[PDB]
Amino acid sequence: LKPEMIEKLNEQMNLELYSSLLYQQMSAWCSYHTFEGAAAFLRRHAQEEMTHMQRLFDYLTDTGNLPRINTVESPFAEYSSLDELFQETYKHEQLITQKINELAHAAMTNQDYPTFNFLQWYVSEQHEEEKLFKSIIDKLSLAGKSGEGLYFIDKELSTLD
Amino acid sequence: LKPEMIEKLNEQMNLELYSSLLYQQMSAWCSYHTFEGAAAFLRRHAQEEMTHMQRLFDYLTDTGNLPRINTVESPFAEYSSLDELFQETYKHEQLITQKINELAHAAMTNQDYPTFNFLQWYVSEQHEEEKLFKSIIDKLSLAGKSGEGLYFIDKELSTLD
Amino acid sequence: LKPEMIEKLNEQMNLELYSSLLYQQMSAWCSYHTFEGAAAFLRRHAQEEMTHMQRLFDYLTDTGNLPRINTVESPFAEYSSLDELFQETYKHEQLITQKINELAHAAMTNQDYPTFNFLQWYVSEQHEEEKLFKSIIDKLSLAGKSGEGLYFIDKELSTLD
Amino acid sequence: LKPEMIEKLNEQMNLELYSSLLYQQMSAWCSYHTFEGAAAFLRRHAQEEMTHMQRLFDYLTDTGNLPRINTVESPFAEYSSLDELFQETYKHEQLITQKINELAHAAMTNQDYPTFNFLQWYVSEQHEEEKLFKSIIDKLSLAGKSGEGLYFIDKELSTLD
Amino acid sequence: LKPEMIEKLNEQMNLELYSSLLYQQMSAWCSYHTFEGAAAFLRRHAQEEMTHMQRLFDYLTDTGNLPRINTVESPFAEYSSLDELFQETYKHEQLITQKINELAHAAMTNQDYPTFNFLQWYVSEQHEEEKLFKSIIDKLSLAGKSGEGLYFIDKELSTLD
Amino acid sequence: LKPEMIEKLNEQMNLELYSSLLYQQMSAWCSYHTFEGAAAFLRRHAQEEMTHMQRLFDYLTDTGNLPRINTVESPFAEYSSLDELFQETYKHEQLITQKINELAHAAMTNQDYPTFNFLQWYVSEQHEEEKLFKSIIDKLSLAGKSGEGLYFIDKELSTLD
Amino acid sequence: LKPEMIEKLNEQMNLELYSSLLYQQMSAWCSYHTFEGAAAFLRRHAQEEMTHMQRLFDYLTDTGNLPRINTVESPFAEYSSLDELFQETYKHEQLITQKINELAHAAMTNQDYPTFNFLQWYVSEQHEEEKLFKSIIDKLSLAGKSGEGLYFIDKELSTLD
């Protein structure tokens, strides 16, 4: 691997690690606010993002490199509502998608076919994730003005996926 | 929960998170240095310490508190050998054990019987952990001290549960 | 057992008996008020509290003592709403928790390790119960302004646990 | 078969093809508007109408004729709401029913007993379809003023049939 | 998705729909001309091309777009023989392959990695399709060229998957 | 397929064939020098390389081309040691990967998306091969300084894969 | 093992290697010429001949000798027809049988009973092969003079042995 790709892969790995902690932190907000269903969904998603991290970690070791875990910023933040919380998760999922595309673009420019091939898994996964997170925001749109609505959506999130 | 208890528990949760990343980082060193067995073993241990973190996370939420994930310092470091690496892991396990004891002591003083009860799981696990890592350092001192031996020990670590 | 511990255990046994009858009485209020789901949940909880009573009864006989069932005050009371009813159950569950902690504190001061050990079961159980009863109050908060909300929560309670 | 019947059967086949595409197009509107449940129901119904087409296609070939697929008009249209969308599907299902009756009437006048016999399947199927599509409009009537209502109906449609 | 991508994909979706109807129409010619085996084979292929259409339809919806089904020209045409018919199908398959390549090229240029990834399924399938239809034209040139042979080839097509 | 691509693909096919016979020849050296485990491993790998050759052969014929097997130079060579041998195999695996990348680049440049898609299987496989062969070299460096060490590694080779 | 037997065994091994590639190449011609059935049959025979090579390679190593793979000339050639191609395969198989007899004869004269014993498998196999290839030519002469016949024979070969 070229130094540029090694570092970009390492940075993405750190981004996935951060994202995992962000969702875990978000779930706590949900629980503290009575949305146990949303909390559970996010916990599940924190675990999923960790998987994304590991896969990158493994790719770096397979290719004879040393993955480096950098300083991690606190994911702690305050949210005004469950809608705002989920809107941010959606915005975040999009940043991840952009980072993957820039990674794929760099792989292609550097003629690194093996890494481009490795990234395909992420490209497919992100398409699915964005769809999923969009729906949630949409549902919140349909029935999110009321606690009974909130109560119902929350119930949905508990098994969503 | 008493404010003081909340803080100590949150601190412990963060220490476990750090500890999980520390072991993930140590396995990378092992892979890079050709010790796939030791690498696989530390990876498994990284996952386990993560469960220790989650257990604390949940306790805080169950008790109506908001766990807070703080900034995590990079666990990146250099090691002169496999022996020095495992020496550091044993010492780090001993630190965790000590922190658990201080928390148990604080729970007792504060007559917080529910938290003290909750901690007993960690006390027992810590006992098992220390013994395990001690055995590893022992084998290294014995069979190790010379290449060929490292091959067999690493081979052992691969499956050591 | 020291006389102090014998009596404290006996009093706790009577408290658990009273609590069982209180929840049974509460379920009647629910049924009389159309909340068959909440009624069912409370009936189930009355039976559970009885178990707590029996376990204490058995501990006293195992140790060669004579458990004594005292006068029981009527648990009858009138409630303004289902929310008030559940708020009282939550307050009651908390009193029970406090009584257990005072019991554990007395056991520790009297160096009665066997009884402290026996109480651990209760300490764990109460942590679970408080959590459970908190959630209900929380749900009532999310969707409890409407009969449709009430109708939905009631439906939940019918299987909760 | 008499020329008149051949052509009427061919036209009906084309009508069924168009209807299939219409429902597919409608499902897209539903999805684009967040009604994934209604979208799924319509997709399923697009596939069903295709079956109706094939059965007619086969009858024409069995009888030694050449079915002809004509120009198909775009089924694209804009709808103001989900209620309007379903009202149109109901009106459309009715047109199909009328076309089948005119087909049965022509078969009878032409003393084409074999085709009248063949149409019986469609006559029965349409009775079922109209009923089904009426209910949906009815349900939309009961609980379709609110997003929570919409949210609930949509949930129903996802498995309706 | 870039507006240009949206348009090309929508166009491709419409081409597949047309292609599905084209094969359905060709099977009719086969039935009428006594080639039941070739008819059954094209029918199966009509259904398959339809799935290609749906896959594109969904992609557009998953990405928050509104797929639009345009007017479909009649696929009706005359053929001088079974050989000429299958020659036309092979050529039509080659056209589809070309269109897929142009779309893949557009996705690359536009750095649309998710769409390019999505198209790989079509690229592979197209490879299988072309080979299949090529084999058919081969057999026809060989065994065909004379009645009796047509009986056996048609017999073959009946089950050719 | 373009002329350049055909030629390049044909060259790669011949390279795989040679690579296969090279590993075959190498296992003999191993057998002759008493390393039955390493011999076994290489024989398996000669077969594997041969499958890579077959897959290319097929692609060429599927696309209507005539694969051409060219003269094959004798792979016979002398090796100083077992590790010298494996170093060679590693270098060779690397060359194959480079050639596969050049082929993927050529496909890109020629907008041959079908061929690019086809090559993806090789790209992923090579990633696995390099990892594997790299591991062997590492194991050899850790415990290959003694007859006893070589003895264990060889034993490990016999069942690797 | 006498040097003369070693040279003769080594020669046969290479001949079998060449034979395998010859059939592989012949299978390509068949493919290019529409005879997918014959191509498949020849593909299967190339693999089979490869095993004849491996068996020789192993005997040489079992006997503490070093098999040597020599340069393999390109097996590429032109064939005017399927008939001529198969006629060449038969002649080639005959050539093989003859070289096996000479080897058996050489083993006898040199009182090399172990090798004579080992060769018996080849003797038995060759008898089978010849019979097989002979039948193919026979069938071709019976029905092979019409594309209809060719088509039928090709279908047969697709599964033959």
Side-chain angles (χ1 to χ4, degrees):
Chain A
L1 291 187
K2 305 199 190 182
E4 169 181 16
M5 300 305 303
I6 290 166
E7 272 322 296
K8 280 197 180 250
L9 286 167
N10 196 73
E11 202 27 61
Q12 187 64 23
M13 176 191 87
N14 278 276
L15 175 55
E16 295 283 5
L17 166 55
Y18 170 81
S19 306
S20 173
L21 300 172
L22 173 67
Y23 296 160
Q24 177 82 223
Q25 188 67 70
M26 275 168 171
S27 66
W29 187 98
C30 287
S31 299
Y32 183 73
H33 283 84
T34 313
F35 306 109
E36 199 40 58
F41 170 83
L42 286 169
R43 217 140 45 225
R44 244 146 39 222
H45 262 269
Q47 189 177 1
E48 194 179 326
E49 221 51 42
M50 200 55 93
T51 293
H52 290 190
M53 187 264 283
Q54 300 273 6
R55 207 179 254 254
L56 273 159
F57 186 97
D58 291 343
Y59 183 74
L60 285 168
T61 58
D62 284 5
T63 62
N65 298 293
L66 185 58
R68 185 191 61 252
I69 294 171
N70 296 323
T71 298
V72 182
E73 293 286 312
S74 173
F76 187 81
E78 32 172 42
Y79 304 99
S80 70
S81 51
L82 185 68
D83 285 75
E84 201 210 312
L85 189 152
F86 275 103
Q87 266 173 29
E88 291 274 339
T89 79
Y90 185 62
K91 257 60 117 211
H92 189 77
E93 282 295 326
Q94 283 181 132
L95 188 217
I96 291 176
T97 296
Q98 179 208 337
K99 289 311 184 155
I100 293 286
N101 285 338
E102 303 193 346
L103 243 170
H105 183 36
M108 216 64 147
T109 303
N110 282 305
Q111 288 161 229
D112 186 349
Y113 301 106
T115 305
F116 181 75
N117 174 281
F118 161 82
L119 287 169
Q120 293 318 296
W121 181 81
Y122 287 85
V123 173
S124 25
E125 224 53 35
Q126 281 307 118
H127 165 87
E128 301 293 301
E129 310 270 30
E130 262 176 38
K131 181 184 174 229
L132 179 66
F133 282 81
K134 205 355 186 133
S135 95
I136 289 160
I137 278 186
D138 279 351
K139 288 184 161 115
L140 258 171
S141 237
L142 207 53
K145 77 112 26 129
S146 38
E148 158 147 68
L150 289 184
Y151 165 84
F152 278 105
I153 297 323
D154 191 68
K155 262 224 168 19
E156 257 214 66
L157 292 161
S158 69
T159 41
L160 208 194
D161 228 349
Chain B
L1 285 206
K2 276 171 200 204
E4 147 179 20
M5 234 33 236
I6 284 139
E7 119 195 326
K8 296 241 188 174
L9 282 171
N10 202 74
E11 264 171 42
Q12 189 61 27
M13 181 199 67
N14 278 279
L15 172 54
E16 299 279 356
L17 171 56
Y18 170 82
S19 299
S20 173
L21 301 178
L22 170 64
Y23 299 154
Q24 173 93 29
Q25 187 62 245
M26 288 169 156
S27 66
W29 186 98
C30 289
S31 285
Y32 193 62
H33 294 262
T34 75
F35 302 116
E36 293 311 322
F41 167 85
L42 288 164
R43 226 145 59 219
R44 287 196 294 269
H45 264 271
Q47 300 167 17
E48 168 172 338
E49 221 52 40
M50 191 61 191
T51 74
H52 296 209
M53 183 267 221
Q54 263 136 29
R55 240 202 168 76
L56 276 157
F57 191 93
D58 293 349
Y59 184 69
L60 284 164
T61 57
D62 285 359
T63 60
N65 294 283
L66 184 72
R68 162 194 206 134
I69 298 168
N70 297 317
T71 290
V72 188
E73 315 180 358
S74 177
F76 182 82
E78 215 17 74
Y79 301 103
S80 73
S81 58
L82 190 60
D83 200 313
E84 164 179 334
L85 185 152
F86 274 103
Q87 274 294 314
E88 284 282 334
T89 69
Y90 178 60
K91 295 350 179 171
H92 183 77
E93 278 294 324
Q94 297 191 134
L95 172 78
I96 290 168
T97 289
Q98 178 204 338
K99 289 320 211 203
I100 292 300
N101 283 340
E102 289 175 9
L103 247 172
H105 180 59
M108 264 291 143
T109 296
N110 290 78
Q111 286 149 244
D112 184 349
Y113 304 108
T115 295
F116 179 84
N117 172 267
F118 163 78
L119 293 170
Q120 295 312 295
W121 179 81
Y122 288 83
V123 178
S124 72
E125 247 346 281
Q126 268 326 107
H127 176 77
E128 311 293 353
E129 244 40 274
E130 264 181 27
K131 177 177 159 200
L132 180 48
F133 283 84
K134 203 208 195 119
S135 103
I136 290 171
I137 271 154
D138 278 357
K139 294 172 168 288
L140 277 165
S141 31
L142 184 78
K145 287 341 124 215
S146 59
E148 294 78 46
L150 291 157
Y151 172 79
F152 285 104
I153 287 119
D154 178 75
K155 211 102 238 319
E156 223 189 288
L157 291 165
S158 72
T159 54
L160 192 71
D161 275 13
Chain C
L1 291 187
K2 305 199 190 182
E4 169 181 16
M5 300 305 303
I6 290 166
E7 272 322 296
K8 280 197 180 250
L9 286 167
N10 196 73
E11 202 27 61
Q12 187 64 23
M13 176 191 87
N14 278 276
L15 175 55
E16 295 283 5
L17 166 55
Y18 170 81
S19 306
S20 173
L21 300 172
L22 173 67
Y23 296 160
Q24 177 82 223
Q25 188 67 70
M26 275 168 171
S27 66
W29 187 98
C30 287
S31 299
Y32 183 73
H33 283 84
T34 313
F35 306 109
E36 199 40 58
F41 170 83
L42 286 169
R43 217 140 45 225
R44 244 146 39 222
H45 262 269
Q47 189 177 1
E48 194 179 326
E49 221 51 42
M50 200 55 93
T51 293
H52 290 190
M53 187 264 283
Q54 300 273 6
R55 207 179 254 254
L56 273 159
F57 186 97
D58 291 343
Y59 183 74
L60 285 168
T61 58
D62 284 5
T63 62
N65 298 293
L66 185 58
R68 185 191 61 252
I69 294 171
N70 296 323
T71 298
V72 182
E73 293 286 312
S74 173
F76 187 81
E78 32 172 42
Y79 304 99
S80 70
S81 51
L82 185 68
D83 285 75
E84 201 210 312
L85 189 152
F86 275 103
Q87 266 173 29
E88 291 274 339
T89 79
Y90 185 62
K91 257 60 117 211
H92 189 77
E93 282 295 326
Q94 283 181 132
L95 188 217
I96 291 176
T97 296
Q98 179 208 337
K99 289 311 184 155
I100 293 286
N101 285 338
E102 303 193 346
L103 243 170
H105 183 36
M108 216 64 147
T109 303
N110 282 305
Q111 288 161 229
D112 186 349
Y113 301 106
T115 305
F116 181 75
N117 174 281
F118 161 82
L119 287 169
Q120 293 318 296
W121 181 81
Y122 287 85
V123 173
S124 25
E125 224 53 35
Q126 281 307 118
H127 165 87
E128 301 293 301
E129 310 270 30
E130 262 176 38
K131 181 184 174 229
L132 179 66
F133 282 81
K134 205 355 186 133
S135 95
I136 289 160
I137 278 186
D138 279 351
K139 288 184 161 115
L140 258 171
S141 237
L142 207 53
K145 77 112 26 129
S146 38
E148 158 147 68
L150 289 184
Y151 165 84
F152 278 105
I153 297 323
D154 191 68
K155 262 224 168 19
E156 257 214 66
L157 292 161
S158 69
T159 41
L160 208 194
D161 228 349
Chain D
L1 291 187
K2 305 199 190 182
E4 169 181 16
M5 300 305 303
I6 290 166
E7 272 322 296
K8 280 197 180 250
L9 286 167
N10 196 73
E11 202 27 61
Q12 187 64 23
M13 176 191 87
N14 278 276
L15 175 55
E16 295 283 5
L17 166 55
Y18 170 81
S19 306
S20 173
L21 300 172
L22 173 67
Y23 296 160
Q24 177 82 223
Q25 188 67 70
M26 275 168 171
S27 66
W29 187 98
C30 287
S31 299
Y32 183 73
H33 283 84
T34 313
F35 306 109
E36 199 40 58
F41 170 83
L42 286 169
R43 217 140 45 225
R44 244 146 39 222
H45 262 269
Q47 189 177 1
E48 194 179 326
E49 221 51 42
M50 200 55 93
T51 293
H52 290 190
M53 187 264 283
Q54 300 273 6
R55 207 179 254 254
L56 273 159
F57 186 97
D58 291 343
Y59 183 74
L60 285 168
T61 58
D62 284 5
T63 62
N65 298 293
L66 185 58
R68 185 191 61 252
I69 294 171
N70 296 323
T71 298
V72 182
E73 293 286 312
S74 173
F76 187 81
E78 32 172 42
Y79 304 99
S80 70
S81 51
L82 185 68
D83 285 75
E84 201 210 312
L85 189 152
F86 275 103
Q87 266 173 29
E88 291 274 339
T89 79
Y90 185 62
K91 257 60 117 211
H92 189 77
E93 282 295 326
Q94 283 181 132
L95 188 217
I96 291 176
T97 296
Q98 179 208 337
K99 289 311 184 155
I100 293 286
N101 285 338
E102 303 193 346
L103 243 170
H105 183 36
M108 216 64 147
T109 303
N110 282 305
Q111 288 161 229
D112 186 349
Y113 301 106
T115 305
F116 181 75
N117 174 281
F118 161 82
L119 287 169
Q120 293 318 296
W121 181 81
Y122 287 85
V123 173
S124 25
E125 224 53 35
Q126 281 307 118
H127 165 87
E128 301 293 301
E129 310 270 30
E130 262 176 38
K131 181 184 174 229
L132 179 66
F133 282 81
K134 205 355 186 133
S135 95
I136 289 160
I137 278 186
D138 279 351
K139 288 184 161 115
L140 258 171
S141 237
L142 207 53
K145 77 112 26 129
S146 38
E148 158 147 68
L150 289 184
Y151 165 84
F152 278 105
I153 297 323
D154 191 68
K155 262 224 168 19
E156 257 214 66
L157 292 161
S158 69
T159 41
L160 208 194
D161 228 349
Chain E
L1 285 206
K2 276 171 200 204
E4 147 179 20
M5 234 33 236
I6 284 139
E7 119 195 326
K8 296 241 188 174
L9 282 171
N10 202 74
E11 264 171 42
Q12 189 61 27
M13 181 199 67
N14 278 279
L15 172 54
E16 299 279 356
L17 171 56
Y18 170 82
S19 299
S20 173
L21 301 178
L22 170 64
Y23 299 154
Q24 173 93 29
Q25 187 62 245
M26 288 169 156
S27 66
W29 186 98
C30 289
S31 285
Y32 193 62
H33 294 262
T34 75
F35 302 116
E36 293 311 322
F41 167 85
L42 288 164
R43 226 145 59 219
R44 287 196 294 269
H45 264 271
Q47 300 167 17
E48 168 172 338
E49 221 52 40
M50 191 61 191
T51 74
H52 296 209
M53 183 267 221
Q54 263 136 29
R55 240 202 168 76
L56 276 157
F57 191 93
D58 293 349
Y59 184 69
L60 284 164
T61 57
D62 285 359
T63 60
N65 294 283
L66 184 72
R68 162 194 206 134
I69 298 168
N70 297 317
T71 290
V72 188
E73 315 180 358
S74 177
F76 182 82
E78 215 17 74
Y79 301 103
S80 73
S81 58
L82 190 60
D83 200 313
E84 164 179 334
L85 185 152
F86 274 103
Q87 274 294 314
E88 284 282 334
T89 69
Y90 178 60
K91 295 350 179 171
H92 183 77
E93 278 294 324
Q94 297 191 134
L95 172 78
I96 290 168
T97 289
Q98 178 204 338
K99 289 320 211 203
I100 292 300
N101 283 340
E102 289 175 9
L103 247 172
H105 180 59
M108 264 291 143
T109 296
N110 290 78
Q111 286 149 244
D112 184 349
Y113 304 108
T115 295
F116 179 84
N117 172 267
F118 163 78
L119 293 170
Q120 295 312 295
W121 179 81
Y122 288 83
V123 178
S124 72
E125 247 346 281
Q126 268 326 107
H127 176 77
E128 311 293 353
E129 244 40 274
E130 264 181 27
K131 177 177 159 200
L132 180 48
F133 283 84
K134 203 208 195 119
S135 103
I136 290 171
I137 271 154
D138 278 357
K139 294 172 168 288
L140 277 165
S141 31
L142 184 78
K145 287 341 124 215
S146 59
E148 294 78 46
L150 291 157
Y151 172 79
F152 285 104
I153 287 119
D154 178 75
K155 211 102 238 319
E156 223 189 288
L157 291 165
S158 72
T159 54
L160 192 71
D161 275 13
Chain F
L1 256 51
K2 284 198 196 182
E4 136 166 45
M5 290 302 309
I6 301 177
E7 180 47 24
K8 270 191 166 332
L9 283 168
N10 202 72
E11 282 169 12
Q12 184 67 15
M13 184 194 62
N14 277 284
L15 181 56
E16 301 284 0
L17 170 56
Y18 171 88
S19 298
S20 187
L21 302 180
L22 172 73
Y23 295 160
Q24 191 68 223
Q25 191 55 254
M26 284 179 162
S27 90
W29 186 100
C30 289
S31 267
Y32 190 71
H33 289 84
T34 76
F35 302 106
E36 276 325 289
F41 174 76
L42 289 158
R43 239 157 28 235
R44 277 198 300 276
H45 271 266
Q47 210 153 103
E48 202 179 284
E49 260 349 278
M50 190 68 71
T51 67
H52 292 194
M53 183 270 206
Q54 260 301 124
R55 242 182 142 268
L56 273 150
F57 186 90
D58 290 354
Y59 184 67
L60 277 173
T61 61
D62 281 4
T63 64
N65 298 272
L66 184 68
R68 173 241 163 64
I69 296 175
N70 283 295
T71 285
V72 193
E73 240 193 11
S74 176
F76 194 83
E78 326 233 279
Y79 302 103
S80 22
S81 65
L82 183 61
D83 18 283
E84 197 232 310
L85 182 142
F86 277 109
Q87 268 293 335
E88 275 302 336
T89 74
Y90 187 55
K91 317 223 188 264
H92 196 253
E93 279 299 325
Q94 280 187 329
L95 160 64
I96 286 163
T97 307
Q98 177 195 215
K99 284 328 209 132
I100 290 308
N101 285 332
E102 287 175 36
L103 252 173
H105 182 47
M108 264 310 137
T109 297
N110 284 299
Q111 294 174 229
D112 182 352
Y113 300 94
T115 295
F116 182 74
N117 173 277
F118 162 75
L119 293 164
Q120 295 311 296
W121 178 81
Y122 289 84
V123 171
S124 88
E125 276 293 311
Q126 279 314 117
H127 164 88
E128 289 317 334
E129 310 276 29
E130 277 195 11
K131 180 180 161 206
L132 168 65
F133 283 84
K134 191 199 141 227
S135 80
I136 297 175
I137 274 293
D138 286 339
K139 291 193 157 91
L140 272 181
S141 311
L142 181 64
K145 302 271 173 145
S146 58
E148 237 205 321
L150 291 179
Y151 167 86
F152 295 98
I153 294 154
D154 186 77
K155 233 135 164 220
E156 176 153 40
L157 263 18
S158 51
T159 76
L160 213 77
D161 249 348
Chain G
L1 243 57
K2 289 200 200 168
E4 155 188 10
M5 284 302 313
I6 292 175
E7 198 36 65
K8 281 208 176 205
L9 286 169
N10 203 77
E11 255 172 21
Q12 186 68 18
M13 183 197 62
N14 276 269
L15 177 55
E16 298 275 10
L17 166 51
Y18 171 83
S19 294
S20 190
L21 300 187
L22 165 72
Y23 298 160
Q24 180 79 37
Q25 188 63 250
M26 273 174 173
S27 101
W29 186 96
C30 287
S31 270
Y32 194 61
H33 296 263
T34 312
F35 303 111
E36 228 5 81
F41 170 84
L42 288 158
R43 248 137 48 189
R44 291 196 297 274
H45 260 266
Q47 210 187 147
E48 181 164 317
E49 218 52 49
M50 191 55 86
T51 78
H52 286 196
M53 183 264 307
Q54 272 131 13
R55 210 192 188 81
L56 274 163
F57 192 100
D58 287 359
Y59 180 69
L60 274 162
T61 64
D62 280 2
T63 60
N65 290 285
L66 187 57
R68 167 155 193 180
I69 300 181
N70 297 318
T71 295
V72 192
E73 251 159 24
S74 171
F76 184 90
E78 325 251 15
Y79 304 103
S80 318
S81 63
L82 189 67
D83 202 78
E84 168 193 90
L85 184 147
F86 272 102
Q87 260 183 226
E88 281 290 324
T89 35
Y90 184 54
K91 263 24 192 150
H92 191 77
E93 286 291 330
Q94 279 186 341
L95 163 64
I96 289 172
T97 294
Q98 177 79 217
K99 295 287 189 209
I100 287 296
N101 283 337
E102 297 181 11
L103 247 178
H105 181 57
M108 271 289 184
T109 63
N110 304 323
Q111 317 181 200
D112 180 349
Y113 303 109
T115 303
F116 178 80
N117 174 265
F118 163 85
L119 290 165
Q120 291 322 283
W121 180 78
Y122 286 84
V123 175
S124 155
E125 276 293 312
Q126 273 317 115
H127 170 85
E128 248 201 38
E129 302 287 17
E130 261 180 47
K131 166 157 146 239
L132 179 69
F133 281 84
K134 175 51 175 137
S135 81
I136 287 162
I137 288 202
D138 279 351
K139 296 177 150 147
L140 278 171
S141 287
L142 181 68
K145 64 131 53 284
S146 80
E148 189 170 330
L150 285 179
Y151 165 77
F152 280 115
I153 285 122
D154 187 75
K155 260 229 193 139
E156 193 153 29
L157 285 165
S158 96
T159 46
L160 210 56
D161 143 272

